[PDB]
């Protein structure tokens, strides 16, 4: 059931993160004696919001929803790093390397394009 490039190419699924089925409500034991790492961190953005700047200083400056104009070029994928287990029991992902940036342009009402480097660099 595993897909190939000729199945995926030009469908938009290459910009998608993999999904887990609804049944996978389980739990993953972190053995404190053993080290861990992340083989692949994918991030697929669905919604980009931009905060307006009302020229008033005060007022309701809320995040307005925007329209993506740079197409299915948005996901960060193939990110690797070490998942440490700390002293106090917490896990800290340190990001090492991957496709960890995408330039994204979204467009507000009025036509203002907003370019951003959507990233999780370091």
């Amino acid at each position: 059931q595993t897909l190939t490039y000729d199945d995926i190419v030009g469908t938009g699924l290459a910009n998608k993160c993999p999904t887990l089925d609804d049944t996978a409500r389980g739990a993953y034991p972190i053995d404190s004696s053993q080290t861990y790492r992340i083989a692949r961190l994918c991030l697929q953005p669905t919604t980009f919001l931009v905060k307006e700047e009302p020229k008033n200083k005060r007022q309701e400056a809320e995040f307005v929803p925007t329209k993506l104009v740079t197409r299915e070029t948005t996901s960060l994928d193939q990110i690797q790093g070490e998942l440490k287990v700390n002293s106090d029991g917490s896990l800290t992902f340190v990001e090492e390397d991957g496709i960890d940036f995408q330039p994204v342009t979204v467009q507000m009402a009025g036509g203002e394009r907003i370019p951003l480097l959507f990233t999780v660099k370091n």
Binding site: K55, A109, G110
Partner: protein
């Protein structure tokens, strides 16, 4: 001939050309309304209906 202020009196007994002149007037008024709206859209700032509404602009 006709004086300048009477040039349009040629339409008085010509219903086909009266209709044509009325159609041309209607084309001019409808064309004004579109071009006025496009001019206003090109200049209207929609970003503040509280202190910069349409009637201030």
């Amino acid at each position: 001939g006709l004086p300048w202020y009477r040039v349009h009196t040629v339409l008085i007994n010509d219903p086909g050309r009266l209709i044509a002149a009325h159609l041309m007037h209607t084309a001019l008024v409808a064309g004004w309304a579109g071009s006025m709206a496009l001019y206003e859209l090109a200049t209207f700032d929609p970003s503040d209906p509280v202190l910069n509404p349409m009637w201030r602009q």
